[PDB]
Amino acid sequence: PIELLPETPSQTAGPYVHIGLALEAAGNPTRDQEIWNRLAKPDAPGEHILLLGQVYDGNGHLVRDSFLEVWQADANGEYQDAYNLENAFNSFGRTATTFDAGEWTLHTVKPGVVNNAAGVPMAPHINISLFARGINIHLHTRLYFDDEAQANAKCPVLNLIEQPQRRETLIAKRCEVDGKTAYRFDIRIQGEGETVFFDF
Amino acid sequence: PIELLPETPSQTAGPYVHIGLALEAAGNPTRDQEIWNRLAKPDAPGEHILLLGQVYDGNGHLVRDSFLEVWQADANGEYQDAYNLENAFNSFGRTATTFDAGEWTLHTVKPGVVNNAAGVPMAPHINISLFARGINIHLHTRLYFDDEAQANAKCPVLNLIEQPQRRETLIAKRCEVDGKTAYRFDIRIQGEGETVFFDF
Amino acid sequence: PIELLPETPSQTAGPYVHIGLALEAAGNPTRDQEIWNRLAKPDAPGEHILLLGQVYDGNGHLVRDSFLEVWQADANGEYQDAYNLENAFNSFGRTATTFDAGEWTLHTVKPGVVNNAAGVPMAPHINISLFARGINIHLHTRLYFDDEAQANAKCPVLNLIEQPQRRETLIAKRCEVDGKTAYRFDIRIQGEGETVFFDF
Amino acid sequence: PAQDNSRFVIRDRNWHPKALTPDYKTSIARSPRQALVSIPQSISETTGPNFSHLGFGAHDHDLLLNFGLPIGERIIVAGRVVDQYGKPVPNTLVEMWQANAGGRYRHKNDRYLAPLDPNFGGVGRCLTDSDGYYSFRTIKPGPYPWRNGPNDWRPAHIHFGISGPSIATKLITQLYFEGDPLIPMCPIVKSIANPEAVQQLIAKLDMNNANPMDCLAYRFDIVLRGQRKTHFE
Amino acid sequence: PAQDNSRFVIRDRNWHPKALTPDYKTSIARSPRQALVSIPQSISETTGPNFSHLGFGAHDHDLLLNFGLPIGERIIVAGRVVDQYGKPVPNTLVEMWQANAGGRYRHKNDRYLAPLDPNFGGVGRCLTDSDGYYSFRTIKPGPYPWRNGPNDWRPAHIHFGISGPSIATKLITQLYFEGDPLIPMCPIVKSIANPEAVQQLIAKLDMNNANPMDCLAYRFDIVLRGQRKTHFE
Amino acid sequence: PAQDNSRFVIRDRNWHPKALTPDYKTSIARSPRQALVSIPQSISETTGPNFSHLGFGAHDHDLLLNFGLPIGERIIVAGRVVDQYGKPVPNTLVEMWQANAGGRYRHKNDRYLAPLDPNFGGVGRCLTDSDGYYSFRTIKPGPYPWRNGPNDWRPAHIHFGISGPSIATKLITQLYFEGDPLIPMCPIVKSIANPEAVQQLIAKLDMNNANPMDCLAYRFDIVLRGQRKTHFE
Numbered sequence A, B, C: 001p002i003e004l005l006p007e008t009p010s011q012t013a014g015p016y017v018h019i020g021l022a023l024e025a026a027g028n029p030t031r032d033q034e035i036w037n038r039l040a041k042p043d044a045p046g047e048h049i050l051l052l053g054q055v056y057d058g059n060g061h062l063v064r065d066s067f068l069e070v071w072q073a074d075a076n077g078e079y080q081d082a083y084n085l086e087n088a089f090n091s092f093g094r095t096a097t098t099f100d101a102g103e104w105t106l107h108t109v110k111p112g113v114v115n116n117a118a119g120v121p122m123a124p125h126i127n128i129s130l131f132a133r134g135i136n137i138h139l140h141t142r143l144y145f146d147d148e149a150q151a152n153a154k155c156p157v158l159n160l161i162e163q164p165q166r167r168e169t170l171i172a173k174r175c176e177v178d179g180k181t182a183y184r185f186d187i188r189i190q191g192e193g194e195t196v197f198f199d200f
Numbered sequence D, E, F: 001p002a003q004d005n006s007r008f009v010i011r012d013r014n015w016h017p018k019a020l021t022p023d024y025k026t027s028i029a030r031s032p033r034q035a036l037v038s039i040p041q042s043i044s045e046t047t048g049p050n051f052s053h054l055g056f057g058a059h060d061h062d063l064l065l066n067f068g069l070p071i072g073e074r075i076i077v078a079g080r081v082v083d084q085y086g087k088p089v090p091n092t093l094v095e096m097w098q099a100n101a102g103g104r105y106r107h108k109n110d111r112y113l114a115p116l117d118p119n120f121g122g123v124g125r126c127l128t129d130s131d132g133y134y135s136f137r138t139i140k141p142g143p144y145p146w147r148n149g150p151n152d153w154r155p156a157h158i159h160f161g162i163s164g165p166s167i168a169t170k171l172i173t174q175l176y177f178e179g180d181p182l183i184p185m186c187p188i189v190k191s192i193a194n195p196e197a198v199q200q201l202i203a204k205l206d207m208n209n210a211n212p213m214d215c216l217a218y219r220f221d222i223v224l225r226g227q228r229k230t231h232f233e
Ligand SMILES: O=C(O)c1cc[n+]([O-])c(O)c1
Pocket: A012, A013, A014, A015, A133, A134, E026, E144, E146, E154, E188
């Protein structure tokens, strides 16, 4: 059979990820430009929401050194790849859990619908990559919204998860934080209610 | 030491086991003679019962593609190996879980007592072999009856199970189905209340 | 790098460890001098205590063939290494769980405070080593007292345990047996509430 | 009726694939977490059905006829069923099943885009003869994509089931074809740790049994647990 | 916006470190027990951010100046980012971080007794050029004692993050230095089962890129998942 | 009392058997799932009991006299206890236990059909000498069938317990006899991943220590964790 060059092996981000990717958190001085948790400027089209959650390990303990990366379409269902701090909206963001509460937050807009390779629309979703110490290779997941029940039912991606009960793990819970629309999305790395992780 | 020819390695039955061993279920035309789930004809001596149950995976999810084979003594506690559709009773049978409900059923007679190699009587039991996708090598178990409490306490096999609590995983629970004597026997492949499996 | 001689590898104590280390328990005649569960003679200085507990496996089943060894300082926080049946106090002891009840007991005195290599004091503790069938290499643990709460919160050792919930697994729960001060210390080898085991 | 006169060589559980083989995704949730409980062989375990009187159809073992002529590589799959002592297992039940030439299964749950074959069913059965020989006639199945890793494909394979003298001997396995490049990538194949065990599942091209100008042939021998008489029991 | 034009070669999860690697204690409780669910690549997975327009500071890639001169081994760390097909990855974001020369990190949580360097921050970032080349200037970090086994020490290493063309290619890894005796001992290194994969993480001394009487250099090429066009989809 | 003057070389947990070795069935439920918590050595860990004043009986180390003459192969089991630095461990406690000639233990729970030996207990103890030498006189134990797989037999072995200078060095192990074919088949033995480690458990035939026309002798050296003085602490 044919073999290509082998992909560089992954390694855990380490407990100090922050010094390199979340300067603020590391408690270090930031640079002029930093990739952070505000995907949308107040004047961005779409329904402005706040995302928040906690990360749990196999023992039910909080993972307080987790680092997350998000990728999502705009309100129009379009991926804005040209990253720029000037943009009103950026499809890409970064966040991390507080060493205290151990909660991550993201400021964005509800993503519009996008179709799969085969022309089928996927329910609004946020693509998440989780990194942290004790994680050798980052974990891929998707955040779906509980108020998109209809779309969710028909999602070609969600539908690949054999057990319906496991699908539920990918659904963020609508709530209000300071009177602002928010969705809570906790990640259970291992055990009971373990979140679905994807390979692609 | 001495070595014989190595036995041919097992392999999972696969999801489509039905095409081969449960024609009907596969939704395919059957042949004139098929090995199925009715071990006893109405005119067979012994107590006619109905066996039923579900199979669960480690997550508590139904295993809808399981394939089971049973082996039991006749009412006299005699193994009838000469398989024939003409017999009023056959010691061998096959069943499978519905793709829907995920339940299997068997039509037979309560087996008579049989003695171990050492001359001690075993409680009435049904030998069961489980097969399915994800199962590399089939699992062996035994179905004992709850109404044979006195017998069960003294069974040399049941007594081999170190932990008394584990013994109960092997006992089918008596009830009635359409006014018929039935026993429900659920197999839990993994986790909480995991069914005892044997090696012989 | 530099390599030394490799230490001889460990093996499980086996089910019949009593024959060798717990003569009585084996139901065999003892010798003139035996190493047993009475560290303190009734007239030894300090607060006399009775310790007892059970040992559970990952299934929550009692481990009835367990064998434990203890090492603690005297009431003055001193390790009496010169073992002698004559001494009023021995720092070293041995015990084992009952083939029936499956409970172990130890008769001693509450240990005094010892400092770590850095000079910081450790809460009063008993060093435990657990052996048994199914245990390839003995497990090390520490027994702390629920009534030394103040000390405990500052122990450099206890503090090394990352998750606060796990620290609780090391705390003996005070009580009274026959009007005597008793501390119950259960060991959960595996699973829910698994006791912290150490390496040194 | 059946009698407890035999004993069976104890299975080598390191030879056979273990229960938990993580690359074969399904195995994770379908493997027991508790150790199997060993039990002495008794009449219960040392006996099993005899299919001597099962009423087999004329083309039970001929997949070319038992369902027009199927499209695909016309082959004969034959061999012998012996025990570990090299003793032949006569009049034993051999059942096989498979996908068509395109790797499509004639099963409800098969959503693969390769088409069905109007003249192909994919089921065969026969009894070993007095010498422990069996033979089937079919077409060579195609590889099949499956949802395991994102690009996994089962090697071309034929599912087999063999009864043997007792339930202690009953086995379900898979035949693979000599030289199939997919063999070594399959997580199902790989559930077997010993490469030597893997070799036993490989049917060999058998020119000597082929019908010139007609159909090739593959040879696949099966070894069931050795049977011995009880002694000094 | 971005478009679904590419497909990325499936990851080799037997090459990358597995999830559960017991010697690396933290992995115990931080690894899924359920199997990863395989999904087809879509626009969501085949696109990612382009950092072409990010405003990079003049010394973003120069740890010697981006935070007095730091004490320690002056080195240049350079190399090229290519995909599995050997195709260069132009204008991609490379980010790195490390400890100082004594093995101390400029991070809240680091309690290691080696002192911080007043002239050293430890963070760098840069975009690869048209030929997929990158380069950083720093000091060689020292080994780091950590609480794993009782005497565990991380080999001198630099943390790296590489974007690539899609989130499908995004990678976080670590670089090690040619000949460091600690490497073969590291439980983190050992999470990787293939010694051949291990070799991919070792930066090689590069005398040709060194600045005589100034600083030495290390070569570290990174390979991202191969990018191919879709066909017959 | 005892003083914290020593440090003990860290244990190599890849040398010793791991906790979870599923073939040894019982290890399944008796192995922790959480990782061990590493702690620095304190006086608590670096001290242990001194058995110099224990009142040993005269025949404590002579299993032939300490319980008629036992039936079985008369042997002397002797060797030396040293640390990893090769330093002898004087006056340390060595205890041994074993079954009789037929593989029968004198214990309540042993229901093996082989009879007990009226003149045999199966327990011995002694203190190493100035040179770290120990010696027992006993009979060669017989193999024992046990409820693991359906046909598991423990190789003939002798259980050993060694105190060493501290609780940090205390060890329990098993001695096996040179050339016994059951050795490589045992799941308990196979709990040890390194064949080289396995080798340290085999007592070698020692004709030089044998008593002509009387008994054979086996040599079994024991190696405890290396002891060194503290430095720059
Ligand atoms: O995973 C960890 O615990 C760890 C600790 C320290 N360093 O330097 C790392 O890179 C990783």
